[PDB]
Design a protein around this ligand. Structure first.
Ligand SMILES: Cc1c(C)c2c(c(C)c1O)CC[C@@](C)(CCC[C@H](C)CCC[C@H](C)CCCC(C)C)O2
Length: 251
């Protein structure tokens, strides 16, 4: 717990908001753990985290799950029960289950923020990071319409230095040709570190995906035990149960 007192001292004297977030030990330790207890880097991440929140009320003010319960019910998102071989939490997102006539890109971004605020409370996740699998099957121009240059920049920011989770891997599967232009909007804002941790698997993804996530994937992606629907429903239930933690850190 080195740097804790120092980190809290800098924050209080920079006039960081006492906000809806008390500078508890557990809160500040998210930032220290994300940056391997490098005080200067944890402080930069902390400042960026508040800056990111202040810039995007739309995504960050209401972490109440009621707005995006529809998206969860549609099967957009679940979190695997087991960790990967190095202890990362593994998140799955399915574009085909995002109706862009119904949910905005900000609503969809809010889903990741909500999940991220919940899983960051796990010390094992703070230490070993996360991997996210994005199944891009069914991506439409109507999805891309909603990814503006501002949205692309905000995506880059949470992947790099604006949220206290280590992104240890991003796996894009079933990526169509028309997606390449969307990614090229995000690319210029990414560090070389993160760029090297993005995997573009294509439409023949199974072998490589199984290599990275042995024995823990849903049936849909070559695993053997549970379905995506099971995992979606379980994460949905957990998020609904979390309504009051999420309310405590809203607005
Ligand atoms: C803390 C944290 C957040 C908040 C987060 C992600 C990760 C890994 C995090 O650790 C990944 C997903 C993202 C960036 C929200 C993305 C929302 C958009 C609308 C999804 C569809 C459009 C994307 C073009 C699809 C590919 C995105 C990957 C390249 C990350 O939100």
């Amino acid at each position: 717990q080195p740097g804790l007192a120092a980190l809290r001292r800098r924050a209080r004297e920079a006039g960081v908001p006492l906000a809806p977030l008390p500078l508890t030990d557990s809160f500040l330790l998210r930032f220290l753990r994300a940056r391997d207890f490098d005080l200067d880097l944890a402080w930069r991440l902390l400042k960026n985290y508040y800056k990111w929140r202040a810039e995007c009320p739309e995504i960050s003010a209401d972490l109440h799950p009621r707005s995006i319960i529809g998206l969860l019910k549609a099967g957009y998102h679940g979190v695997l029960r087991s960790r990967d071989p190095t202890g990362s939490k593994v998140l799955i997102y399915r574009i085909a289950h995002w109706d862009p006539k119904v949910f905005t890109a900000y609503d969809v971004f809010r889903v990741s923020l909500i999940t991220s605020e919940l899983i960051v409370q796990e010390v094992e996740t703070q230490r070993n990071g996360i991997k996210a699998i994005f199944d891009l099957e069914g991506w439409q121009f109507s999805h891309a319409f909603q990814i503006t240059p501002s949205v692309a920049k905000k995506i880059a920011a949470v992947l790099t230095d604006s949220f206290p989770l280590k992104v240890r891997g991003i796996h894009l599967i079933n990526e169509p040709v028309i997606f390449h232009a969307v990614f090229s909007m995000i690319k210029p804002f990414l560090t070389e570190k993160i760029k090297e941790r993005i995997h573009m698997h294509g439409n023949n993804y199974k072998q490589s995906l199984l290599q990275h996530f042995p024995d823990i994937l849903p049936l849909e992606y070559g695993g053997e035990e549970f379905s995506m629907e099971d995992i979606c429903q379980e994460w949905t239930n957990f998020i609904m149960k979390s309504e009051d933690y999420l309310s405590s850190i809203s607005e």
